[PDB]
Structures are given as structure tokens and as C-alpha cells.
Amino acid sequence: EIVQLLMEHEQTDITSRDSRGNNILHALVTVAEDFKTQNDFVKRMYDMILLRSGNWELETTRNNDGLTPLQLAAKMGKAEILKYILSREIKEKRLRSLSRKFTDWAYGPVSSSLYDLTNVDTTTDNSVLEITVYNTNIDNRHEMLTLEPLHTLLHMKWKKFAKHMFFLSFCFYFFYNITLTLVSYYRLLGRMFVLIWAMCISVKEGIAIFLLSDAWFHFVFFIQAVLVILSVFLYLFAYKEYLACLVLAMALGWANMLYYTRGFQSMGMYSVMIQKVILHDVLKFLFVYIVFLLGFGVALASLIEKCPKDNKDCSSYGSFSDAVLELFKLTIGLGDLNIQQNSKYPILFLFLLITYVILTFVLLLNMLIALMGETVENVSKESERIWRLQRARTILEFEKMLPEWLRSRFRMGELCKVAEDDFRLCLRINEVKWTEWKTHVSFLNEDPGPV
Amino acid sequence: LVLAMALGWANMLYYTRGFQSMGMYSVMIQKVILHDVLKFLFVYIVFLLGFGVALASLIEKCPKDNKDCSSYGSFSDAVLELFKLTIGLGDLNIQQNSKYPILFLFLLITYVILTFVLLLNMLIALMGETVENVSKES
Amino acid sequence: ERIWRLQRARTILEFEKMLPEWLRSRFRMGELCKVAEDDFRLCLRINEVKWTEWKTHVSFLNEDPGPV
């Protein structure tokens, strides 16, 4: 009521930017915490204020940061307000311009909604899409992407070219790794292309990391390329030994191949499960297990510190590294076990060695508990939100790798006419609604024909 | 003939599908082998090749005509040793017929770790859907 | 999680008991505040936010909402 009173006065200045430069709309976007908290009233005030001023000025302006209110809601973790903005259908014939969501035709429950892509597509300097995707500050990007226009843009771009580009890069990397394997196993015409590709990806990864738990793979590729260039430079020198590092990069290369399983749906979910959760858990598991290994191997080597007496087979665990290897054998089940000689207390030796096994077993059971507990519900949704998010990030990466003229050629979206003699980009999406029935007063085209 | 025998005794499982308990049993077999196991097998074959090439490369050091000295000599031999290891039958030991025991051991340990983690993720992906969808779908 | 929080509180109290009087006096959490009728007592501050329950705030110690 007070807002109505204020807007009715002619002395009022709706367009007044504060010291920070923000309009009313930027401010409201700075406040939309979530639905469970507010009960979604700020959206109502946004709508009312727009309807009080039939113009584009408020949404067009920028703050001192240089961002529209839309770009601002994308910058923050603000979804409901964005869902509203990107989907506005105003029945008022006079204020039809302000709407972004348009119904081209509604013969019945089937109808083609015509969304708008003025500052949403990647054509602008900073699109809503790049803003949503290239910020890890929010931790809500999945709820941001599931919206109609952005979701459809991403999947249509994947349908057009990005699938081809990803398969292309995967084929190149597959060829590269096959060449590396052939070179290493049997150790010139192929090695040249290998080295050139290595230097290319080295420069790429270096630049990307200079620009920089998602970017780990960049460091992985960088390490692989560094190892490859190092081994190839050392090869020129008369050093047979240096070549030993080659297989290391090869092994690392195969880890990089895991990255490309991120593409397929099932394989992608499986790969994210490989990457994140298992890292988080098994890294701590491995750290504690290694400290156990050291703490027990030192003791065992100390007990068996007794002299061998011209018998090395009697000196099992004799070397500390040898003792660690023997416990590795034991936990896996490789090492022939027996009551060790050269121990003043063989019974206590065996007791400690069995306590090792019991501790390792209960430790395995602990990690199993942690994994099965996390795997219930958090893993599914988290892995989906990570997978689709990384896919969209890489889609935009491929799109940025391109030049201007090709992008122009593609031209996602169709130019279309909106009332009041306007022409703008739009996106057509066919959708059905059985629950709601109504006379479609707001329709762009009388004839529901597709063409 | 013998192959058929094997396949034949894999086919009796079919008739187990009659019983309700054995019915859900066989259907769980089918669903798991279709969904989770193929991923494990494929990517594990990938790792087998990626690591066995390197193992054979290091084992390229000639044993002077002694297959026992330079274990992991043949590529298929190294893969068989890796299989025994993942089952635990092998008799591992630092091979004097090698230029680098340190790198050999580190790579073998990383292989074992990766295999264990991959098996573990197979188990996790199983448990994830285990509770809700399995019973009803079966 | 319950046992974790519980044992962490136990440890915190143990370490607090390990300290001397003067360091404890230094790390005293809370602040003196005037409540009512020449009453000065210790208090703990928590800034809270509520978007649901709307009401004209009648009862308040300080007229100016400034932190200091």
C-alpha cells in the first residue's frame, strides 16, 4: 500500500540510482533469499513495480559494477526471481512489450512458447549463461540451469555441434595415446605429430591454468605435457635412463582419458563418482593406512633387527622397505607367512602382526560404512548437478574456442516479430498443459501452423 | 562340446526364474550385469592395457634367456600376473631383471589402488539404487 | 554427529580448565550490557534475521541499531 502511495506521486523518482548505482530492481534481487524463507512476495513487488512503469529503462540500466538486474540475479544465487523474469506473460495488450515469454499459437493444450534471448545468449559481453556457469560462488547452479530457456539452449547446442567437437577431441586424444603406447612399447614419422600435439596441449593447459574441484584435469594435462616434453628433450641426449619417465606420462594419459567418460550419461555419472566421492574418502583412508604401515613396519624391522647369520631368507622383513612390501603382500594376500625368526619374542611378533590385520579390516569396514552412508541420496543429486554443470561449462568452452563468423553462421534462435513493431531474437519451445484451460487471448499468430 | 556344457550350466539359471525368490535373484543378476558390471570391465581392461604396456617396457631388460628372471616379460604374461595379483595368487617380488625397481613398485601399487577403488565404486553405484528401485523393478 | 559434538565440547571444556586465571579472563566471551534499572550484566550477542514474522518492534534496549 505504501509503495502504491509512493508511486502515485509525481515527485517520485523510480529511476533513482543509489550511491552504489543500483535501481529498485537490483536491490530486490539483493534480497530474494529463498522461497521457504520469504514466501515469494518480492516477486510480486517486482511485477507491481514493472506494471507501474511501462518501460525498459529499469531493466536496461547498470550498477557501478556494470550489471543489469538480470545479470545480478545470475551473479547471486537467486532463482525464483530469475524464473519469473525469464518467463513473463503479460495479458495486458498495452504492456505486452515488457513480456519476454510469448505464445505464438495455442490451438489447445499444445502451445509454442516463444522466449527471448536479448542479453541471455552468448552474443553479449557477459551473458546470463556464462555468468551462471562460470561462478563457483553460488553452489546452486543446477537449480539455475534447469530453467526452460537455458536448458534448451544448452541441449540444442549439444545437438548441433558440441557433440561433434567433443567426439572429435576424443578421437584425437585416442590417436595420440595409441601413438604414445606404440612408441614406448617398441622403444619417427608418427613421433613428430605426437610432439606437435603435445606442445599444443601444453600451451593450451598452461594458458588455461594461468587464467585459472573442477579444474584439476587442467593440471593433470599440464603435468602430462610437461613430462612428455621433458622426456622427449632428454631423449636427444645419450641417456637411456631418462626414457624411463615416459611410461609415467602414459599412465597419467590414461587417467586423462577417464575425463572423456564424462560425456556419456551413465559413463559420466560413473566417472564423477570415480572422481569426487572416492577421492574425498579414500584419500583419508589411504593416509591413515600409510601411517599405520610405517608405524608397524618400523616395529617389525626393529624386532627382526637380529642378525641374519649368513641367511637372508631367514631375514624376512630385514629391509624396512622390504617389511612394508611384506605387509602389502599380507593385506593383499601374497606373502607366505610364518613365525619369523630373529625375534626374541615371536609370540608378541605374531600378536602385533595379527593386530595389524584386524585394524586394517575394521578400517576397511569403516570406509565401507562411510561410502554406503554417503551413497544413499547425496551422491545421486550431487553427481547429476556436477555432471550437467561440467557438460555446460565445456559446451561454452567449445563455443568460445570458435571464431566469430562460424558462431554467426550457427545463430541459435530465430529472429521474430513482437508487438509494437519490434523485432528480436526468440526461442520456440512446444509444450503441453492439460490442467489449465482458458481462452487464449494473448497469441502472436492466429493460425497455429508451424511455418 | 565343453563350451556348450559351460553355457548349458549357465542356462539352468533360466529355470530358477520360476521361483519368486530365485526370480528376483535372476532378474537382479541380469540388471546388474547390464548396468554396473560392463562399465567396470571396460574401464578395467583400459587400465590393464595402459599399465601392462609399461610393465612389459620395463621388463624389456633381457633376462639372458631366463623367463623366470624377467617376469612380466610378455605383454599377456604381465596382464596374467596383474590378474593373479587382483585375485592375490601371484608371488610378487622385486625383479633384478629390471632397470628401475622403484618405479616398477610405485606403478604396481598405484595399479592396485586404482583397481580397488574401481571395484569400490562399482559397489557404491550398486548400493545407490540397491534399496528402492531394485525390489520394485525386479 | 551427536557424539562428535559432545566429545568436542568435552575437550573444549577440558582445555579451558587447563588454562590459568588470567588467560581465561582475557578470553572471556560475552560483553557487559545495561539491561534495565541500573542493571549491568553479561550478555552474548547474536544477529538474527526473520522474513516471516512481521511486527512493529516495540521492545528494544538501544534506539539506534548501530553495532557499537
Numbering used by the authors:
A (entry chain B): 276 to 462, 484 to 508, 518 to 756
B (entry chain C): 551 to 688
C (entry chain A): 689 to 756
Could you share sentences copied from the article?
In contrast to other thermoTRP channels, TRPV3 sensitizes, rather than desensitizes, upon repeated stimulation with either heat or agonists. The TRPV3 channel, like other thermoTRPV channels (TRPV1, TRPV2, and TRPV427–30), is a fourfold symmetric homotetramer.
To elucidate the conformational changes governing transition of TRPV3 from the closed to the open state, we determined structures of the channel in the presence of the agonist 2-APB (TRPV32-APB). A single cryo-EM dataset yielded three distinct conformations, TRPV32-APB 1, TRPV32-APB 2, and TRPV32-APB 3, all of which resolved to ~4 Å resolution or better. Strikingly, two out of the three TRPV32-APB structures exhibit twofold (C2) symmetry (TRPV32-APB 2, and TRPV32-APB 3), deviating from the canonical fourfold (C4) symmetry previously associated with thermoTRPV channels. The reduced symmetry is conspicuous in the pores of the TRPV32-APB 2 and TRPV32-APB 3 structures, where movement in the C-terminal region of S6 in diagonally opposing protomers results in asymmetric gate arrangements within the channels. In TRPV32-APB 2 the distance between the M677 residues in subunits A and C is ~5.7 Å, similar to the diameter of the closed gate of apo TRPV3 (~5.2 Å). It is thus possible that this arrangement of subunits represents an intermediate state. Interestingly, an overlay of S5 helices of subunits A and B revealed that their S4−S5 linkers contain π-helices that originate at two different positions: at residue I583 in subunit A and at residue M578 in subunit B. Since the π-helices dictate the angle between subunits, it is likely that the differing positions of S4−S5 π-helices within the tetramer are responsible for the twofold symmetric arrangement of the channel.
